[PDB]
Symmetry: C5
Subunit: 346 residues, 5 copies
């Protein structure tokens, strides 16, 4: 017999009329390319740019009847990646690329094998920086849906149709963890067929659901925003005579709370709508600012203090501290129930 690279030069050379610019089944039914991906790495999900970097193995399988040998005795013929300019390949691209590249270290990372009946496996390694629009209406408790979609570019729907295969169309690597998110195991697979004025082009896509990990935000920006509210409660257990204390406590807490509010959106996109970390800060702004306005009611009623009625005006000024010691730590707990039930329903 003869070696396969000399045998594949007979299948692809000047003889046999194989022309690599012409799709299989020409002037016939369209080419049914079936696809599946294998996610090696995932992550660096930025939100300022609203993008995420994935690192996939893109496998494509089609049928090319001109490559159907019957004399060489094997069942699969590998190609050198140097000879990948010699067969037809589908012009797949990603409709939200935002920059992508191959991997060409120590060899082009490309695989190509040809079965006997003409089935062609073609596996390459791609690094993508895909774009997904973030929806941050409920921000530490959101379930993002970042997608990726695989169109054709030169061939219309009556020449080339993409399909996901039925045998596990999206595999994920074995120990693929993410720092901030978790990747849910149910991955949607649906069509996204595009219509332009050039024609109608095929498109398949895969949705990935990325549920967050709330445990980070629960440590940096919910509990230190809950202690400073309790500092504003301890002004109530000091008498109406340490005026440099209860004012100075109602100033340093309400102005370290503004730093918490501005520091809550340090690395976020400047979205117009109000998000679920903003109706925690702008309500805990309100509790630490109502503790300062409580003392400004005490020291104003007390300075208004005729003997008999003003002894009750001092007693009116102590009756308001027998209420705000109980009202504020049991209205803030009513809000703390209406908040966490709202975002564990929506």
């Amino acid at each position: 017999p003869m070696p396969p690279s000399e045998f594949l030069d007979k299948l692809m050379g000047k003889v046999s009329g194989y022309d690599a610019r012409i799709r299989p089944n020409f002037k016939g039914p369209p080419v049914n390319v079936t696809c599946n991906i294998f996610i090696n790495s995932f992550g660096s999900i930025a939100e300022t740019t609203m993008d995420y970097r994935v690192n996939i193995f893109l496998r494509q399988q089609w049928n090319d009847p001109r490559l159907a040998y019957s004399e060489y005795p094997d069942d699969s013929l590998d190609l050198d990646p140097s000879m990948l300019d010699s067969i037809w390949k589908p012009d797949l691209f990603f409709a939200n690329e935002k920059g992508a590249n191959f991997h060409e270290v120590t060899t082009d990372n490309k695989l190509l094998r040809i079965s006997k009946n003409g089935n062609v496996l073609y596996s390459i390694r791609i690094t993508l920086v895909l774009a997904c629009p973030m929806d941050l209406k409920n921000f530490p408790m959101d379930v993002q849906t970042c997608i990726m979609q695989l169109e054709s570019f030169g061939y219309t729907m009556n020449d080339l149709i993409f399909e996901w295969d039925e045998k596990g169309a999206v595999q994920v690597a074995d120990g693929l963890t993410l720092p901030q998110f978790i990747l849910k195991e149910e991955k949607d697979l649906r069509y996204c067929t595009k219509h332009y004025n050039t024609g109608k082009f095929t498109c398949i896509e895969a949705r990935f659901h990325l549920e967050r990990q709330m445990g980070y935000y629960l440590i940096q920006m919910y509990i230190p925003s809950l202690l400073i509210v309790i500092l504003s409660w301890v002004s109530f257990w000091i008498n109406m005579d340490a005026a440099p204390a209860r004012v100075g406590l109602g100033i340093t807490t309400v102005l370290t709370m503004t730093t918490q509010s501005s520091g809550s959106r340090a690395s976020l996109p400047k979205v117009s709508y109000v998000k679920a970390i903003d109706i925690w800060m702008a309500v805990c702004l309100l509790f630490v600012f109502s503790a300062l306005l409580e003392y400004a009611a005490v020291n104003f009623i007390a300075r208004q203090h005729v003997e008999e009625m003003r002894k009750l005006f001092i007693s009116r000024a102590k009756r308001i501290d027998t209420v705000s010691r109980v009202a504020f730590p049991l209205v803030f707990l009513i809000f703390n129930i209406f908040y966490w039930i709202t975002y564990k329903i929506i």
Copy 2:
């Protein structure tokens, strides 16, 4: 019959005299290239660099009478993108590129089809980082106009003329949203014909209007700049005896206001002129600094306090707190009306 790639080698080969370095209609009328773009992605509109990243499909259509076949029975002949060095193509470029690249993942993202009469469609995918000069005179309420312009580089006006087509010269993708801006639906299309000492070169351009979303700035830098003004009002409801309080309230507010003023321009270009976020901070600097100077009038008139006249000097010192409780929250509201009417007219 014969397959089209063998047929197009007859239209472009050594026979028939087709020379890819020579424009259509040579020594004749100029080539009327008509253009339209399709914006896939838009955004990352930085203002430190004053640029924005767009991701377009650039379609070009011209007429090439040497490619007018009449024997092959179809109506459109696709090319392989490998054979794009074999026809004439217009040397379009972007006059404010600032860096740009093609997309070459799994295939060169290029499309080329040739009709029977010689009409050539040519669609490529480009990522641009275009430069637009920002005008930030009224900064959270501005309507930017960031443009893009498509010149020729080697052919003058008497050889190649660009036109926008009449059938929707700028399409935008279906769900294209922006984080900070909104893209207005009216897009200007006008000529920008350049004159150099080399010649006069054709140019068409498209204006994009990018109205901001004020809802972000309304949460971070208008309301926390409006609470700290109200902290400087609560010094008035404390008597002229808590000297560590009303001074300490007129210091911490007026120096957390400087942090608001410096934090207002954290990620902005260092422009020379004064912008609409600066005449909100440098007026709310003035209200929280006039509350400190109000107490320095109280505690100086009171320390000046002969029995009969100085009892009115204490009463003069309380008459000024029966005025500044009403004057300052009803002069700040007069400014708050003159401000928001001014920037919802201009």
Copy 3:
């Protein structure tokens, strides 16, 4: 005799049937490629991205019986790196590349020599940015294990098998130091054989253990977090009459401690779990917040002060300062023993 480049064109030319697309020992036993690396540079171990940049010399040795000359008198024949497209080479790649490149300054940095029996040495220079998942459960005292793994891409296990050689499979450069870490001298070498639906592909890997240097974190974020706890102790040595002092000391310390807590995770990945620098800050939050609640017990018992019993209520209010001067600096030392024994066992 004749020069070696004319001699190697006899070994690789049109004569002798050497085909560079066909592995050695075709239709036979697999090719035993043996590998070892030489780490020139190491480091820039980022944790936001969870990656590290290495700069290696990748040596590969296999056996190619078609290159076994016997007439030329030397024992080793170098190649020009221009003629590296003319022999077979293993298609090694790194299964966690995340971007990598060759070095091509003044010459392609590639080495290739061929012995007499057919042994082929092949040494190239690669810069890698490898991905390793960080485990930060005990963060300033952790021993990371960042790995690198060398698969095949086109050849399955029955065609190409990777091995580490027995003579020092991972060398490290002479004075290779790291800024933050130290590289332990025991390096694990184990197999990582992959199974896909394409086939089973060979894989070898090398574990690197990266023990940190605790001496940085001991200066920035343990001792300044230990002085501010001692500032909250000095409130106890001031009487229950300087109410602007002991409150103002129990506010500035407990709110500069929040800046220490937020500044503790300035450049860290937003992990969900709680790490060993967080149960030092959120316990030293508790000591500086219990010094403020100690005074709120003193000034509330003292303001509650009938002649005989209230003289003991003042004495009850001084008995609590004869306890908290000794309890708090000898409970914080009990925690300071339970902490550092826990993370010098785990």
Copy 4:
């Protein structure tokens, strides 16, 4: 007649002996290349890196007598940019490149036309990141001089001489504005002929003067550094009895002034010399620190207060507040005159 690309293959082919490796007028007088640039974009003038990004059209004109046709009837023959490897071109480079690239979007952005007598116009588009050493001795009021210089690399002075042309050697685009600087209209043009041990190489250069816009620094770092000085003046209008006030005012101002001093050099190169923004901060450090030392003279003379002499010692302690209310706002204005006259002369 025949088309020009077939005509230029007669001027440059195997016939006529045109060799693209050999300069015009060989073994004769040097080639007089004349140059002029056209600045499309300018800016991103960083000072940490001390570089600036320019985007030019580099036009070069020389004379090549071997390209002097006389039979083809036109007056100018364009080239395809694909055929730019076929004539001689000057090996110009930029002696302070620091990285540069061409622009190759939709076509190589290169222009080449050949007149009848042999004059060759050659216009390319380059993006440069040029290096200019910043001189920051007087920092918000400095006039930078950032240059660019165009040497030869392989040909010495007796083979190739660069010249600026007399007809406007540096053009600037129509609406080219800069965010921080303004580009003065007088641009110096002078020679920079280099001497190495290889030979003497030609060099021309163009100076650009970049006067700043002081209006940004006048809003962020001169007026907020002028209000905090006036806060330190308002300690004088409070009596010598509010010891928590005048000390607390002489501490918060003098320590928010240190943040102004460190925030003054947030994004500057760490230069050794003292600059004009540093002798404004380190003098306004001195005024807000002399207001604290003024009170430490008052409360120390007052606590030193025998009946008759100490009544004047209280009166000595009020005589010092009848001086520092007028001395400090009329010594700070003497400095404010010596400062702004000094940097509007130098």
Copy 5:
């Protein structure tokens, strides 16, 4: 005669047997390549990455007896940089590259001339980002030694030997200044011959000494760390009765000093050892913290005050303020002498 490019095709063509893959003096003595560099630009010496960017002209001279013409009448023959693949060139590389690139703007920046006896000058332009390990034990007063080393990659010591030439082996450009450092004029030149298991490879290197400019650190982080120590001295000149003052002065200074300590290492590598800017901050931490503990001794001895003995206990409490006004500004000056003599000896 005939032009040199036709003459050099006779020296390098199919005739004369010149093979560009075979070094000069084959099967003979090694090739003595002599080198010297010319530093155009230097700097951007980062310390987070521990690297520095240099921009050199690398000149190499060797002897190639096959290029020794004797008939053409000149003394030097330039090459086109297009014909640099036609002679032998040494495979030099930089053993600490960390990324490097050529410069290819308007022409490949390469020079090549061949003398009559066969001497070959070869000058290229390279941008390097070289790695140097920083030693920061004495950080604002350190003399770094950042090196660069030039190995061979494919040829061992018995085939190719690098040498520095005796006539000024490292030139520096005329006005090369650095922002933070100064480049000392004595540059060490020494051998660095490497031994691997492949062989022994030649290596030469050049040390550069980079003495810092202390004048920046003397303005930002020594004098503002020296004023805050003097603020902690002014607590001594206020009596033991303004308890909100001397405590509030011993809190704001000792907690703005922690910001100085954390801000001292904002842009530094996280090294384990203690550096000379850290034993200035952590000693000026100690002086501003001993001023707070001095008042906690005063107000505790005074509150301990039977008539006769306690009048001396008040006098004991004023005797400690007649000592700490002189002890602390004359112990801090003893440290300020032991510090600056220590780092101007080491």
